Design a binder for this molecule. Structure first.
Ligand SMILES: *[C@@H]1O[C@H](CO)[C@@H](O[C@@H]2O[C@H](CO)[C@@H](O[C@@H]3O[C@H](CO[C@H]4O[C@H](CO)[C@@H](O)[C@H](O[C@H]5O[C@H](CO)[C@@H](O)[C@H](O)[C@@H]5O[C@H]5O[C@H](CO)[C@@H](O)[C@H](O)[C@@H]5O)[C@@H]4O)[C@@H](O)[C@H](O[C@H]4O[C@H](CO)[C@@H](O)[C@H](O)[C@@H]4O[C@H]4O[C@H](CO)[C@@H](O)[C@H](O)[C@@H]4O)[C@@H]3O)[C@H](O)[C@H]2NC(C)=O)[C@H](O)[C@H]1NC(C)=O
Ligand SMILES: CNC(=O)C[C@H](NC(=O)COc1c(CN2CC(F)(F)C2)cccc1OC)c1cccc(Br)c1
Ligand SMILES: [Br-]
Ligand SMILES: [Ca+2]
Ligand SMILES: [Cl-]
Ligand code: NA
Ligand code: NA
Ligand SMILES: [Zn+2]
Length: 807
C-alpha cells in the first residue's frame, strides 16, 4: 500500500493501538510493514550510550537522546536502564538474590491482577536447560525456584510459525490453519511464506489467540510480535515502559520473543561450540527483565513463563534424499521440501497425475530409505495433521537428521547449514522447554512433560479469562499452579446402556455361523449364570464403565473374562474391557474351534453381524476384541467366539492384531504386574480426529450393514507402583495406548515379510496415543470411577508414551 510517512512518532513510540494505512505507524510491527513514520528510528529506537548505567552516569542530567536513563527521575518516568538500582543505588541483581517462595502476589497499589509475561525463545532445545546450565544463571534460577518440566512437547510439524501460534491458541495446526512455515491454500489460491506480505492477511490465522481472548474479556494485552531489527534490549525496555503506564492503560499480558538460539542453531548445529554465546546472550536478556521487574517492585508480582517453540537436530546437506531418485515424473509435482515433505500436482490441468503411483514409487524402494510416504489420513493419529485443505494429501515423514528435496540442484542452487527442525514431535531433539515462575505457579516443583497445546488454558487461568474452545484438556495442568486452578466436572453420560438377558433361541439366528460347541451340572450351571450377570465385572472393569457421550443404543454384556459395551447401531462393541494378571497363561485357539462363531442369545439376530457377509467379502476377514488366547479356562474360551466379540479385519491387519493379542498383552502383564486392557474400533473416515456418525462411514463389509473401522485402539492401564498388581492398585495409575490404522496391506512396515516379532511392535510404537485422542475418536469418557482426583485423571488422559530414550 501507499504510506504517508511524513506523520510523526512523537509521543507514540511502541503505541498499543495500531493505525490503518495510509497513516504512518509507530507500533512493534511498523518495520515489518515498511510503514513506520519518518522519525521512528530517531525517536523510538534510540541507542546512545548503550543499555547499561555506569557509575559516572548516576545522577546524570536527563538527556532524552539516551537509549535508557540513569538520572534520578528515571524510576518515576519508568525508563531507567535495567541495571540502574544495582550500579547507582547499591542494589543486587535479581540472580544474585536467594530464592524465596512467593506465597502471595506482592504487587504495587493499583495492580488488579498479577501481570503475565511470556518470554518465548525460538529453537531452544529441551536439553539446553542441563547442558548449558553453566552459562545461563538467570534461566537456571527461574527453573530451580519456579515450576519446570524436564521438557515440553511441541506440535507437528516442529516448525516455528505452527508452534508459536499453537502456544497462543491451544489449537493443533490443522485447526488454527498455520500448517507450516510455507503453505498454499487452494480455496484462496494464495501462498504463505515467512518472507513477505501475504502472511499478514488475517484469513490465514484461525482460532482465537490469547491477546484477542484477553481483549474481548476486558484484559489489555501488549503486542506479541516484534520486528526482527528491534534489538532485544529495546523489546525489554518497551515491556518495562508499558508496565509503568497508568492502571487504566497498562496491559496485564505481554510477550517477548527471541530469534535465538534457533538462528545460530541452523548455522552451527544444536551443540556447535558457537552456541554457547547465544545461550549466554539470551540469559543476559532474562537478567535484564528480572532486574527491570525488581526496580519496578514487580519481581514478586508477575508470573513469568519461559517457553520455547521446538528444539533443533543435526542436519547437513549431505543427508538429503532426492525424489528424482525415485520418481520418473519429477517435474509434474510440487514439493514442500526439508524436514517434512508435502507433495501435490504442479498443474491441476494435468490429468495424468496420480497420487497412488507416486506413493507406490516412494514406498520401501531403497534399503535404508530415510523418509516414509503417507496419504495424510494414514499419518499416526497423535500428529493430528490432516484436517485442513492446506495440508497436501501426500505427506513424507522424514527421519531425524535428514532432509528430502525434489532434485540435487535444489540443494546447492537455491555446505551451508548444520541444524534444522520440523521432524515428528516425539523426537527427542525437537522437544523444548517450559518454566513458570511467580506467585500463581508452584515453588521448586518439577512437573512431568506435557504438550504445548495445554498452555493456552493455563495462560487464560493466570489472567482470569475463559478460554476460547481449544484442544488443551482444561484442568490437566492444575498441578502447575498454586491457585487459579480450574475445577471441571466430568461430562454427563448421554446414553444409558441396556443390560439384556437371554432373550433369543439359537434357531432364531440365520447368520451362517458355525461352531463345534455342543458338549452337555448344578455346580457349574449357577456359576455360568453369575458370570453372565456380572460377577467378575470388578476384576475386568477396574475404572468404571466408560460413559457414552452421544445418543446411541447399546448393551452391556458381561462374561467370565471380559465386559463389553455392544452397539446395536454399529453391530460391534464400542469398547471391550479385560484384565490380565501377571500369572495369566496364554493358550491356543483349539483346532476344533478355528472357524467357530457363536450367536449371542442376549442380542437379536437383527442387531448381530453374520458370517456369510465375511465369507462373501473376499478382501475382509474378522478378529475378536477380547482375545481367545487369553481365556481363563477351556470353558470360558467359548465366550470369546461370540458373534458380539467379533470385528471386521483385513487379513494384513490380523497379522498385527494376532501378534498384539497372543504375545504382547502377556508381555505387558509380565512387565507391569498385570494390565487392564480396553480395546475397540474407531471410525474416522473424514480424518477430523472425531467420532464419525453412521452416515459418514465409507466402507462396509460387502453385502452388509457392518461398518469397517478405520482404526483399532487399545488402552493398557496398570499401577504406577508396579509392586501392586493392576487389579489391587491403591495409588496413581500408569497408561500406554495406541490407535493402529486398520489397513489392507502392511506397506507402512518395510520389514513386514518378516516374522511379526521384527516389525509389529515398532508399528504400534509409531501409533502410540493419548487416552484423550481415543476419547475424541470414540465419544467415550474413560476412568469415571477411580479413587483419584479428577485433575490427576485428566493428566493421565493426556499422557503420551513415546518410546524415545532419556533426554
Ligand atoms: C480442536 O479444537 C477445535 C476448537 O474447539 C475443534 O475444532 C472445532 O470443531 C468443530 C467441529 O469440526 C467446528 O464446529 C463447526 O463450526 C462451523 C462454523 O465454523 C466457523 O466458525 C467458527 C467459530 O468462530 C470458527 O472458529 C471456524 O474457524 C475454522 O474455519 C476457518 C475457515 O473458514 C479457519 O480460518 C479456522 O482455522 C477454522 O478452520 C478449522 O475448522 C474448519 C471447520 O469449521 C475446518 O474445515 C478446517 O479444516 C480447520 O480444521 C469457522 O470460521 C459450523 O458451521 C459447523 O456446523 C456444521 O455441522 C453441523 C453438524 O453438527 C450442522 O448442523 C451445521 O448445519 C453445519 O453443517 C453445514 O455445513 C456443512 C459444511 O459446509 C454442510 O456439509 C452441511 O450440509 C451444513 O450446511 C460446526 O459446528 C469448529 O469450527 C472448529 N473450530 C476450529 C477453530 O477449528 C477441533 O475439533 C479439536 N480437535 C480435536 C481432534 O479434538
Ligand atoms: C523473524 N521473526 C519471526 O519469524 C517471528 C516473529 N514472531 C514474534 O515476534 C512473536 O511470535 C509469535 C507469538 C508470540 N507468542 C508468545 C507465545 F509463547 F505465546 C507465542 C504468537 C503467535 C505467533 C508468533 O509468531 C508467528 C514475527 C515477527 C514479525 C512478524 C511475524 Br507474523 C512474526
Ligand atoms: Br499476525
Ligand atoms: Ca470423523
Ligand atoms: Cl513447512
Ligand atoms: Na472374507
Ligand atoms: Na510391508
Ligand atoms: Zn528454525
Amino acid at each position: 500500500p501507499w504510506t504517508a510517512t511524513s506523520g510523526s512518532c512523537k509521543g507514540r513510540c511502541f503505541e498499543l493501538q495500531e493505525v490503518g494505512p495510509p497513516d504512518c505507524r509507530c507500533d512493534n510491527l511498523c518495520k515489518s510493514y515498511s510503514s513506520c513514520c519518518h522519525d521512528f528510528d530517531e525517536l523510538c529506537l534510540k541507542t546512545a550510550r548503550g543499555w547499561e548505567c555506569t557509575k559516572d552516569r548516576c545522577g546524570e542530567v536527563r538527556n532524552e537522546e539516551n537509549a535508557c536513563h540513569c538520572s534520578e527521575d528515571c524510576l518515576s518516568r519508568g525508563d531507567c536502564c535495567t541495571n540502574y538500582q544495582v550500579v547507582c543505588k547499591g542494589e543486587s541483581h535479581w540472580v544474585d538474590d536467594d530464592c524465596e517462595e512467593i506465597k502471595v502476589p506482592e504487587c504495587p497499589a493499583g495492580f488488579v491482577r498479577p501481570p503475565l509475561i511470556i518470554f518465548s525463545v525460538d529453537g531452544f532445545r529441551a536439553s539446553y536447560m542441563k547442558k548449558g546450565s553453566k552459562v545461563m544463571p538467570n534461566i537456571e534460577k527461574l527453573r530451580s525456584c519456579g515450576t519446570h518440566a524436564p521438557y515440553m512437547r511441541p506440535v507437528y510439524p516442529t516448525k516455528t510459525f505452527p508452534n508459536l501460534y499453537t502456544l497462543a491458541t491451544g489449537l493443533y495446526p490443522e485447526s488454527h490453519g498455520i500448517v507450516g512455515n510455507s503453505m498454499y491454500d487452494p480455496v484462496f489460491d494464495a501462498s504463505f511464506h515467512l518472507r513477505g506480505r501475504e502472511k499478514f492477511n488475517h484469513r490465514w490465522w484461525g482460532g482465537q489467540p490469547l491477546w484477542i481472548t484477553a481483549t474481548k474479556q476486558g484484559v489489555r494485552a501488549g503486542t506479541f510480535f516484534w520486528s526482527v531489527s528491534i534489538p532485544h534490549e529495546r523489546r525489554i525496555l518497551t515491556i518495562l515502559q508499558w508496565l509503568s503506564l497508568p492502571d487504566n492503560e497498562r496491559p496485564s499480558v505481554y510477550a517477548f520473543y527471541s530469534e535465538q538460539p534457533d538462528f545460530s542453531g541452523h548455522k552451527y548445529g544444536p551443540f556447535g561450540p558457537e552456541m554457547t554465546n547465544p545461550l549466554r546472550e539470551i540469559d543476559k536478556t532474562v537478567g535484564q527483565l528480572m532486574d527491570g521487574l525488581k526496580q519496578l517492585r514487580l519481581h514478586r508480582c508477575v508470573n513469568v513463563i519461559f517457553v520455547g517453540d521446538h528444539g533443533m537436530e543435526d542436519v547437513t546437506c549431505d543427508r538429503t534424499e532426492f525424489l528424482s531418485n525415485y520418481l520418473t515424473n519429477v517435474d509434474d509435482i510440487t514439493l514442500v521440501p526439508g524436514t517434512l515433505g508435502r507433495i501435490r500436482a504442479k498443474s491441476i490441468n494435468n490429468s495424468k497425475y496420480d497420487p497412488k503411483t507416486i506413493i507406490a514409487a516412494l514406498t520401501c524402494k531403497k534399503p535404508d530409505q530415510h523418509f516414509k510416504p503417507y496419504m495424510k489420513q494414514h499419518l499416526p493419529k497423535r500428529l493430528h495433521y490432516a484436517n485442513n485443505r492446506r495440508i497436501e494429501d501426500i505427506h513424507l515423514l522424514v527421519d531425524r537428521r535428514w532432509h528430502v528435496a525434489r532434485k540435487p540442484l535444489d540443494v546447492y542452487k537455491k555446505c551451508f547449514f548444520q541444524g534444522d527442525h520440523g521432524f515428528d514431535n516425539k523426537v527427542n531433539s525437537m522437544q523444548t522447554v517450559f518454566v513458570g515462575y511467580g506467585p500463581t505457579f508452584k515453588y521448586r516443583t518439577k512437573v512431568p512433560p506435557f504438550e504445548n497445546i495445554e498452555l493456552y488454558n493455563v495462560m487464560c487461568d493466570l489472567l482470569g479469562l475463559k478460554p476460547a474452545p481449544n484442544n488443551g484438556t482444561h484442568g490437566s495442568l492444575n498441578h502447575l499452579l498454586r491457585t487459579n486452578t480450574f475445577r471441571p466436572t466430568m461430562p454427563d453420560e448421554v446414553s444409558r446402556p441396556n443390560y439384556p438377558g437371554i432373550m433369543y433361541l439359537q434357531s432364531e439366528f440365520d447368520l451362517g455361523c458355525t461352531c463345534d460347541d455342543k458338549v452337555e451340572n448344578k455346580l457349574e450351571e449357577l456359576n455360568k449364570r453369575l458370570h453372565t450377570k456380572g460377577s467378575t465385572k470388578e476384576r475386568h472393569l477396574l475404572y468404571g464403565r466408560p460413559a457414552v457421550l452421544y445418543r446411541t443404543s447399546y448393551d452391556i454384556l458381561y462374561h467370565t473374562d471380559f465386559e463389553s459395551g455392544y452397539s446395536e447401531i454399529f453391530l460391534m462393541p464400542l469398547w471391550t474391557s479385560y484384565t490380565i494378571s501377571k500369572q495369566a497363561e496364554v493358550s491356543s485357539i483349539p483346532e476344533h474351534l478355528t472357524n467357530c462363531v457363536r450367536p449371542d442369545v442376549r442380542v437379536s439376530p437383527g442387531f448381530s453381524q453374520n458370517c456369510l457377509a465375511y465369507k462373501n467379502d473376499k478382501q475382509m476377514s474378522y478378529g475378536f476384541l477380547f482375545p481367545p488366547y487369553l481365556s481363563s479356562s477351556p470353558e470360558a474360551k467359548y465366550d470369546a467366539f461370540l458373534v458380539t466379540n467379533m470385528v471386521p479385519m483385513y487379513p494384513a491387519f490380523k497379522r498385527v492384531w494376532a501378534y498384539f493379542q497372543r504375545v504382547l498383552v502377556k508381555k505387558y502383564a509380565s512387565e507391569r504386574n498385570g494390565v487392564n486392557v480396553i480395546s475397540g474400533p474407531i471410525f474416522d473416515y473424514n480424518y477430523d480426529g472425531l467420532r464419525d456418525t453412521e452416515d459418514e462411514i465409507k466402507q462396509y463389509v460387502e453385502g452388509s450393514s457392518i461398518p469397517v473401522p478405520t482404526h483399532y485402539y487399545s488402552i493398557i492401564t496398570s499401577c504406577l507402583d508396579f509392586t501392586q498388581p493392576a487389579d489391587k492398585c491403591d495409588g496413581p495409575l500408569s497408561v500406554s495406548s495406541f490407535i493402529l490404522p486398520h489397513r489392507p496391506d502392511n506397506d507402512e512396515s518395510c520389514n513386514s515379510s518378516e516374522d511379526e516379532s521384527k516389525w509389529v511392535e515398532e508399528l504400534m510404537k509409531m501409533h502410540t496415543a493419548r487416552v484423550r485422542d481415543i476419547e475424541h475418536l470414540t465419544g467415550l469418557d474413560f476412568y469415571r470411577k477411580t479413587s483419584r482426583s479428577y485433575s490427576e485423571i485428566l493428566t493421565l488422559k493426556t499422557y503420551l508414551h513415546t518410546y524415545e530414550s532419556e533426554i
